[PDB]
Amino acid sequence: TTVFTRILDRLLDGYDNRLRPGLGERVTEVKTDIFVTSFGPVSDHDMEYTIDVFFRQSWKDERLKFKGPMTVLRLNNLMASKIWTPDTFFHNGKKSVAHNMTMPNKLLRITEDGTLLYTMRLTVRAECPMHLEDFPMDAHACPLKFGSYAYTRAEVVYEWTREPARSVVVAEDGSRLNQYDLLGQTVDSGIVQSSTGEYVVMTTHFHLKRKIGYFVIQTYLPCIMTVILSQVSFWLNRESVPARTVFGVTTVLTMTTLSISARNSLPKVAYATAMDWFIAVCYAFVFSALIEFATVNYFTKFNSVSKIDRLSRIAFPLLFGIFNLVYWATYLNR
Amino acid sequence: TVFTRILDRLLDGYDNRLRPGLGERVTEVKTDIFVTSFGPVSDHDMEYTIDVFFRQSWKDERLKFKGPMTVLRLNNLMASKIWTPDTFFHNGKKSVAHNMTMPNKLLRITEDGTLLYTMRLTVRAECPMHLEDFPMDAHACPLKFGSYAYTRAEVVYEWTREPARSVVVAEDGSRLNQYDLLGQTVDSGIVQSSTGEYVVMTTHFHLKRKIGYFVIQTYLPCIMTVILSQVSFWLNRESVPARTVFGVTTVLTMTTLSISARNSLPKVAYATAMDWFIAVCYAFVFSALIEFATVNYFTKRGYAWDGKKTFNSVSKIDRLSRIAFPLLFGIFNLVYWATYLNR
Amino acid sequence: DVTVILNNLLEGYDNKLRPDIGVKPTLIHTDMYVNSIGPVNAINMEYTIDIFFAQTWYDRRLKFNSTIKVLRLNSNMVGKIWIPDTFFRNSKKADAHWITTPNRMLRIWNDGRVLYTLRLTIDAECQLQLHNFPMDEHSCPLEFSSYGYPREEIVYQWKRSSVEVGDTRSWRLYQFSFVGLRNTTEVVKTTSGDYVVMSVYFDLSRRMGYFTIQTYIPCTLIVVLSWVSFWINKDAVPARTSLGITTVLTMTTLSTIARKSLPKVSYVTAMDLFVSVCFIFVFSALVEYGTLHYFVSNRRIAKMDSYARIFFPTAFCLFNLVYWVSYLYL
Amino acid sequence: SFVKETVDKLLKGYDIRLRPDFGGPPVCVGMNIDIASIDMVSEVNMDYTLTMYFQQYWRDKRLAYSGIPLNLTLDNRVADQLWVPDTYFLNDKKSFVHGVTVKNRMIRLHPDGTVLYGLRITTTAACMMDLRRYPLDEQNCTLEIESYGYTTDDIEFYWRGGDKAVTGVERIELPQFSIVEHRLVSRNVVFATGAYPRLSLSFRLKRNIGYFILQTYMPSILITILSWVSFWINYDASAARVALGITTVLTMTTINTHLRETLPKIPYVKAIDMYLMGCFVFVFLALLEYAFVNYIFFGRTDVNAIDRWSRIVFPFTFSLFNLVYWLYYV
Amino acid sequence: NMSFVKETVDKLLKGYDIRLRPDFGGPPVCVGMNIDIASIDMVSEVNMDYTLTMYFQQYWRDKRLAYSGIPLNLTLDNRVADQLWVPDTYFLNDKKSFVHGVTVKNRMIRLHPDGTVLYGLRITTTAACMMDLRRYPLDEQNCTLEIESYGYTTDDIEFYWRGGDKAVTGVERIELPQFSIVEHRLVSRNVVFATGAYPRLSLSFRLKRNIGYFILQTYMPSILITILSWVSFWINYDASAARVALGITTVLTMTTINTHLRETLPKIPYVKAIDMYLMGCFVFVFLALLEYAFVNYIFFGRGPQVNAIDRWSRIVFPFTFSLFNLVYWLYYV
Amino acid sequence: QVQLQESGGGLVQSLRVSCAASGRTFTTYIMAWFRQAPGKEREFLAAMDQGRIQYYGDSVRGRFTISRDYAKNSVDLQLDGLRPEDTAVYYCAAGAGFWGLRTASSYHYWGQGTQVTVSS
Ligand SMILES: *[C@@H]1O[C@H](CO)[C@@H](O[C@@H]2O[C@H](CO)[C@@H](O[C@@H]3O[C@H](CO[C@H]4O[C@H](CO[C@H]5O[C@H](CO)[C@@H](O)[C@H](O)[C@@H]5O[C@H]5O[C@H](CO)[C@@H](O)[C@H](O)[C@@H]5O)[C@@H](O)[C@H](O[C@H]5O[C@H](CO)[C@@H](O)[C@H](O)[C@@H]5O)[C@@H]4O)[C@@H](O)[C@H](O[C@H]4O[C@H](CO)[C@@H](O)[C@H](O)[C@@H]4O[C@@H]4O[C@H](CO)[C@@H](O)[C@H](O)[C@@H]4O[C@@H]4O[C@H](CO)[C@@H](O)[C@H](O)[C@@H]4O)[C@@H]3O)[C@H](O)[C@H]2NC(C)=O)[C@H](O)[C@H]1NC(C)=O
Ligand SMILES: *[C@@H]1O[C@H](CO)[C@@H](O[C@@H]2O[C@H](CO)[C@@H](O[C@@H]3O[C@H](CO[C@H]4O[C@H](CO)[C@@H](O)[C@H](O[C@H]5O[C@H](CO)[C@@H](O)[C@H](O)[C@@H]5O)[C@@H]4O)[C@@H](O)[C@H](O[C@H]4O[C@H](CO)[C@@H](O)[C@H](O)[C@@H]4O)[C@@H]3O)[C@H](O)[C@H]2NC(C)=O)[C@H](O)[C@H]1NC(C)=O
Ligand SMILES: CCCCCCCC(=O)OC[C@H](COP(=O)(O)O[C@@H]1[C@H](O)[C@H](O)[C@@H](OP(=O)(O)O)[C@H](OP(=O)(O)O)[C@H]1O)OC(=O)CCCCCCC
Ligand SMILES: *[C@@H]1O[C@H](CO)[C@@H](O)[C@H](O)[C@H]1NC(C)=O
DSSP, X not given: OHHHHHHHHHHTTTOOTTSOTTTTTSOEEEEEEXXXXXXEXXXXXXXXXXXXXXXXXXXXXXXXXXXXXXXXXXXXXXXXTTSOOOOEEETTBSSOEEOOSSSOOEEEEEETTSEEEEEEEEEEEEEOOOOGGGTTSOEEEEEEEEEESSOOTTTEEEEESSOHHHXXXXXXXXXXXXXXXXXXXXXXXXXXXXXXXXXXXXXXXXXXXXXXXXXXXXXXXXXXXXXXXXXXXXXXXXXXXXHHHHHHHHHHHHHHHHHHHHHHTXXXXXXXXXXXXXXXXXXXXXXXXXXXXXXXXXXXXXXXXXXXXXXXXXXXXXXXXXXXXXXXXXXXXX | OHHHHHHHHHTTTOOTTSOTTTTTSOEEEEEEEEEEEEEEEETTTTEEEEEEEEEEEEEOGGGOOOSSOSEEEEOHHHHTTSOOOOEEETTBSOOEEOOSSSOOEEEEEETTSEEEEEEEEEEEEEOOOOGGGXXXXXXXXXXXXXXXXXXXXXXXXXXXXXXXXXXXXXXXXXOOSSEEEEEEEEEEEXXXXXXOEEEEEXXXXXXXXXXXXXXXXXXXXXXXXXXXXXHGGGSOTTOHHHHHHHHHHHHHHHXXXXXXXXXXXXXXXXXXXXXXXXXHHHHHHHHHHHHHHHHHTXXXXXXXXXXXXXXXXXXXXXXXXXXXXXXXXXXXXXXXHHHHHTO | OHHHHHHHHHTTOOTTSOTTTTTSOEEEEEEEEEEEEEEEETTXXXXXXXXXXXXXXXXXXXXXXXXXXXXXXXXXXXXXXXXXXXXETTEEEEEEOOSSSOOEEEEEETTSEEEEEEEEEEEEEOOOOOTTTTSOEEEEOOEEEESSOOTTTEEEEEEEEEEEEOOGGGSOOXXXXXXXXXXXXXXXXXXXXXXXXXXXXXXXEEOOHHHIIIIIHHHHHHHHHHGGGGGSOTTOHHHHHHHHHHHHHHHHHHHGGGSSXXXXXXXXXXXXXXXXXXXXXXXXXXXXXXXXXXXXXXXXXXXXXXXXHHHHHHHHHHHHHHHHHHHHTO | OXXXXXXXXXXXXXXXXXXXXXXXXXXXXXXXXXXXXXXXXXXXXXXXXXXXXXXXXXXXXGGOOOSOOSOEEEOGGGGGGSOOOOEEETTEEEEEEOXXXXXXXXXXXXXTSEEXXXXXXXXXXXXXXXXXXXXXXXXXXXXXXXXXXXXXXXXXXXXXXXXGSEESSTTOOOSSEEEEEEEEEEEEXXXXXXXXXXXXXXXXXXXXXXXXXXXXXXXXXXXXXXXXXXXXXXXXXXXXXXXXXXXXXXXXXXXXXXXXXXXXXXXXXXXXXXXXXXXXXXXHHHXXXXXXXXXXXXXXXXXXHHHHHHHHHHHXXXXXXXXXXXXXXX | OHHHHHXXXXXXHTTOXXXXXXXXXXXXXXXXXXXEEEEEEEEETTTTEEEEEEEEEEEEEOGGGOOOSOOSOEEEOGGGGGGSOOOOEEETTEEEEEEOOSSXXXXXXXXXXXXXXXXXXXXXXXXXXXXXXXXXXXXXXXXXXXXXXXXXXXXXXXXXXXXXXXXXXXXXXXXXXXXXXXXXXXXXXEEEOSXXXXXXXXXEEEEEOOOHHHIIIIIXXXXXXXXXXXXXXXXXXXXXXXXXXXXXXXXHHHHHHHHHHHHHSOOOOSOOHHHHHHXXXXXXXXXXXXXXXXXXXXXXXSSOOOHHHHHHXXXXXXXXXXXXXXXXXXXXX | OOEEEEOOOEEEOOEEEOEEEESSOOTTSEEEEEEXXXXXXXXXXXXXXXXXXXXXXXXXXXXXXXXXXXXXXXXXXXXXXXXXXXOXXXXXXXXXXXXXXSSGGGOOEEOXXXXXXXXX
């Protein structure tokens, strides 16, 4: 009882938290590992994702060696604020939260030999730049880069506690993704240079593939059916001018409605995606089926089946099938 | 050397819990506001944002000092140990005192004991609106501020200069997309509450909405749709499918325009001027098709007159409607516009 | 002078203990001044309110003998003396104001009476029953009590000027109209103990002008427009078919607006009932023509249009009479 | 006077850094919760928000006092001077304690040394939702309570009151859901380092189907039925059957796009997508049937036989599709 | 060794008064600033502001913090910043800003032996940017960031870009959703007033909006609808149902496109180039339908008391619409 | 046509090798260098992503320097302390780093290659 209090009071006598351990003598090596409790939602509109992690950091501080009956000392967060800790920050973090409900979710442990373990529970919102040119058949590698903010490569170096593949552990039920599929993660470390010097950066990349079935049912299938419906009018007799005219214009309106809804399901970007080109081609096909009828009607003087209609019943399904094969082989083979 | 000594001696025996001249006089605070940018106005939330440099000057005889220096700039830590007015905005919702990269506050002390307190604030304030004349509406958004705990018997507020020149707006400090900042009116008064009578300083900014967007987006498409509905009166009565499709497709077009027009407007439960305009256009488009139902009810021969038996004469109902409908719609537009543009 | 009085008062004063602890309950008189009632967010079932909340109690430990009658202070002494832990029970989110200084007032009389007022913005919770929407009436409450002190330690009581309001037009109510205000007091039994809960109920009634212009009238006009087919000759098949199906499409378009500003409640509101019935009317009009065309051409019955010209307007007027009586009056 | 002396004696020498029974048996911490409300069940964010009164009971011999039969309710700031468990919520994303008018926290002491520590917390807890059966889906959302830095050799958790520890669940009204039941689980998370206490509170939410019946299924059914009217229209009425078929296709597209805009964005196939797509296929085939009839009659067994066959097959196939859909998802 | 550094730091912080600037009674302290931009996001036209995250470094010399005998630059704990003097630098057009604090407050204090102090901050700030959208979407924007000293004139403090034109880095690595940074500029100037001159730094960008999405979703469908409305001119005048249904359905389609682009695009309540083009196409399809109404009235109404008007329109409408496009694209480009 | 033109190299007993990218801006792409010994395999040497983070292999850690000119859209490699073991074909690669930024299968745009011969 009183021995613990004595050791706690004796620990901080003469300690200076403003100085890193081994200042001017060696490099402070920090061993880190991450346990991801949940890989939260990925926001396409904001180009960011949320992740809930248990961040663990271990290092050696000779100034905190103690001798006593106990082998491990557990520090109160108030006492943990009086001891130097690495200033680890996330390079691509946008707005992170250090949970303190109902108490600060931090834990500092000291072994008898002066080795400190610092575990904290964090919710990190990090930016994931995306190339949406192949939307909705795109794949991304959302990064998570962290490192020291103030200490250069010559002062503090980060390392993974175990082999890098096994250092970052994701829970079995961790994935909380509706639109993506977490294929895996790669763990690596590198060196960056800024105007303040060289820094060590620890990076983890999570590889996500978007689910395509939703866009197939909501957008691709209705567009294909609408184009087939527009080409169906080629089999009506040429004397039904109001019928084929209403068919053409209402198919154009249906395609316009589908295009607008399909765009409303895509984040607001100003470049052209793959679905934008698919919709534009379907729009061109529906427009052409009506220009074709206008050309058939311009020569309708019993009347025979128009040779324009006969050629269009073959050309339009063939041209649309060729476009479909080119489009899918273009994007499903990347 | 002497600077540090004076700073250390200034707060000797100073009680920041007591206002200057307590039990002797009335603390007089002179205020002026520099509006760096009149921020956006949220019609949905009925609030407006504004970024200002708020300046307050008063006299505290407990802070007199002597030395070569004439004006003392105070550190924020030292400035937090000195009594300052508890000025608050009566209609403010959630104001932000900027803290980047340091607190945006400045306290200057003269040897006479006068203090100048300047701070930079983003003020979100309530601007009640009556949108019965939307989009041809004008509003006077107020900004009222005063002391919270001190009545007029203790603390009073005055403008440093004439009220017109005590509130200054920058040349390019206008962040309004839909309104125009006509000007500001500056005044002051007394408000009596359950605890006492408080001095209130008010500034009213006058805004007028821009009608051009609603004319291009709503009024013109509705007018043209009505004209299209009235156009069917010149079609021959024998073309029943054509005039029927014309009538119902114009009704659907008016429904689409009414829906998108009410999407832009914030959700109010009363009818605006645009709601009445759309309702009247809807009535006109409905009546055009009822008119065709009446014309069709008196048509005998299905066939129509050709280039060269008997044929249907031009309906007197159509002949009258080709005049009555455009005339009634023109009169309605003349009344509606003279009613709301003269506001 | 005043500094000596303040130092004497603060000397030997423990703010962990309520006044008259272990002797009698602390009687607290509460007053509220509603500055404005913000918008009612029916989607999240909540509403915003901005108030000046005043509390008055007696603390015999703060008596001082002097020529000064009352000490008028700022929020500086708030943390120095004991303050009731009043909290709002149905508040999803509440914030005080701090610009430019903590918007608080503290006044201490020589006999020990303490007045503590502060400005608050409260997002209170209101469970809206929308069965009669848009002809619905609500009484949104606002309850507060001490968090830790039971009825044997802190008792709340309304002062004579309990709840006060200013200009009701200046309030931010777009969809509702303030039509009354009540205040109650009761004892709520919880696991921790029995607490005195004071409630303020604000009565709100929705205005139907916008829903009348936007939904009820266009739907009625479209139903009447769909009755036009009955007066079109039965030989004009494309005309009556295009009129019927375009009226169905327009009614489908209008049915979108029915559920726009309200949560996804799974019971039939009055607006949904009216829209669904109008959709059924135009559906039956088109089915009626399909039946007449089939029997007359593809195969009393021949006079079906004659009876439909009477039955459809009559059935719709009967429906409107029942709807507007069961909702406007009953 | 005497209470001030007793409280000061209790707080004199207290070491916040040491748990009760520092070197002895683990301290038994009992917990009970009162759910004030639940709201903002977000399928997009896969989480939910609840406000609750979280109360903890434990015994500390260092805080035992004698001579006072009362239960001392202290100011909440004394909680900063006492030892409290490091209780946290594992699946919590963003939580806070309400602080109006003061921090919503209570500390109550008992003469035998029992401490009651209450907090009013609004927390947003992550809930993994499977929506493949949406809107006919049943969700199971939990709340995990755990000790951050203590094993079972130092702290133990139990529900105070057994199955009655959590109260207020039966009074929760969710506009879109219904709470079928809730369960309490008290288990130890056994690891290599040691066992960690854990308490689980779980609700089973059942989505209400009435909203989707009124807004999604009935409009689609009525439009699909209307598309069958063309089967009874004479095959010569090309301008009427084509207009009816393509307008019903446009109406189905309008319904589908409106629902895609008003329903939450869940980018994978759900039961509502399968139903909407099935209705779109049925109206597509209904228009194709007339296109086949027109081509057979004009371009080239019997023209009237295709229509007569379709007048039976289309209602039959659509009813079989509904029977399969409703049995598979219920 | 380490104890020597500890005592050196104690000596430096012994008697240091954070209320006095370096060279308090002498020449102004020159403050060099550089910015490393990490990313730009949420360029909002409705709120007329953009949010950027940057590493903001400030160098200045303080002779009170000069130490000898240590050949190393002393990077100290960030909380020592609360024990030193730092410039009162604020962003003039900032609306809402904060410093990241995970896992600790993202700031640095590096001391050099000669007394030079490096003070770095990681700041995410939402800066106001008044945008002129009359040419939207064929527009360019100029968004700035003003850096000023709150309570010090040029007699007390001075600002300059350390490194000159290379002071700001990371601009070319930014990838905005619907913009494209063309160039950026650095401006150092004094705001001259009667009281005195105040230092000011200005970092400005030039944003060019991408047009691909607007081409595919706004202009091309409207052009196709307008061309479809011309089909009525090639149908016989006696086909009343066909020509009326085509005209009024193209009017309905144009209305659908206008209203849905109104909802999809940001709420900008004044006339833009996109609105002018959509209104022009709506007028063209309106006149195309009115032409048929005129033809039908000529043939049937004033008949007893028509291919020429259609032949005339088959040329005038494509020509007038092409001229309207030529004027439109020459005006806004 | 998008191309990765590689310059420099040749017979070397300090060597700088460039890689110009045309037809596509690689501002937000990971640009890497790869070495292919004769008949053995393709070996990862260095890489740099959008954030200027530099990655290096164990055998070339501290020896080779990778730098990206985002303005000119090019990537340069600085070879120092060359050895006969480094005599192989050098390629310039650019990709999104899907499934590891060190695997050759993650890169799509490849340069024509450069031959570097080291004789001692
Ligand atoms: C989990 O972690 C979270 C954080 O991630 C944590 O939340 C934090 O909780 C703490 C409390 O535990 C909060 O700190 C308190 O804040 C009180 C005011 O809060 C408002 O202001 C905050 C910023 O402070 C500025 O403004 C206040 C007044 O508004 C002012 O007092 C400050 O000095 C400061 O302003 C001055 O100085 C700055 C520079 O520092 C200048 O820039 C400025 O111009 C001015 O000069 C702000 O952050 C708050 O917003 C946050 O919280 C609200 C909560 O509702 C939320 O809605 C927001 O969204 C946002 O999150 C808010 O606007 C402050 O009063 C407290 O200080 C009191 O009490 C402490 C107690 O220890 C005491 O030490 C202080 O001295 C002080 O005593 C008071 O002072 C009062 C006047 O200020 C006075 O009326 C009282 O009587 C009393 O006594 C006086 O003291 C003065 C001064 O010493 C003296 O002269 C008098 O004589 C007399 O003695 C305290 O700082 C913190 O803000 C929360 N942060 C966040 C992000 O939420 C959470 O609690 C954690 N949970 C757990 C379980 O651990
Ligand atoms: C939402 O979804 C969650 C997750 O699926 C549901 O939570 C689960 O609820 C069920 C039902 O309440 C839980 O089962 C109960 O678990 C308790 C605790 O068991 C733990 O502690 C025991 C302490 O003595 C220990 O013995 C257990 O270990 C044994 O069992 C495990 C397997 O569970 C086995 O691996 C070990 O080897 C042991 O054999 C374990 O550590 C348990 O006490 C309950 O037992 C009751 O029922 C059994 C039935 O045979 C009976 O024999 C007992 O006498 C007693 O009556 C019961 O097994 C389950 O643990 C919960 N899962 C989690 C992860 O919390 C939740 O219910 C869902 N919500 C809703 C509303 O449905
Ligand atoms: C809301 C209006 C309700 C009006 C209700 C009353 C409507 C009402 O009275 O209709 C009759 C007539 C119809 O007009 P229209 O000229 O089309 O009808 C002629 C009329 O029916 C003659 O009687 C027919 O000759 P007859 O039978 O062989 O001798 C003649 O046959 P044909 O030889 O030409 O083929 C028909 O064409 O209209 C008015 O007189 C205008 C009234 C005011 C219209 C005011 C419109 C604003
Ligand atoms: C309600 O308030 C009035 C004052 O407006 C007061 O007289 C009455 O006693 C209050 N009712 C209750 C139950 O407190």
